């Protein structure tokens, strides 16, 4: 199934739209653009970053312990 005309029921909502040949494709691209991206980054760092640094630390350590385990001093 599918099809427009049979999706669902909606009432009382107006939608104003504009021809693409009437507006610009990049309104305030950097002006509003960058602030947004920072915001999105902020919104997600605490959830995305922590596991990755946890891997990073385990990666560099695990590497050092490997290299330094293959040498001997006394005994």
């Amino acid at each position: 199934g599918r099809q427009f005309g049979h999706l669902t029921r909606v009432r009382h909502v107006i939608t104003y739209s504009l021809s693409p040949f009437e507006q610009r494709a990049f309104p305030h691209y950097f002006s509003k653009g960058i602030p947004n991206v920072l915001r999105r980054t902020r919104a997600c760092i605490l959830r995305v970053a922590p596991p990755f640094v946890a891997f990073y630390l385990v990666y560099t350590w695990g590497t050092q312990e490997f290299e330094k385990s293959k040498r001997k001093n006394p005994a």
Binding site: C44, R47, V48, P50, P51, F52, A54, F55, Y59
Partner: peptide, 20 residues
């Protein structure tokens, strides 16, 4: 859902460890 977001990326990171 943030508890799950955290767990998800832990899963990704844990696969990255597995790759390594």
């Amino acid at each position: 859902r943030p508890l799950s977001q955290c767990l998800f990326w832990a899963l990704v990171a844990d696969l990255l460890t597995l790759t390594w």
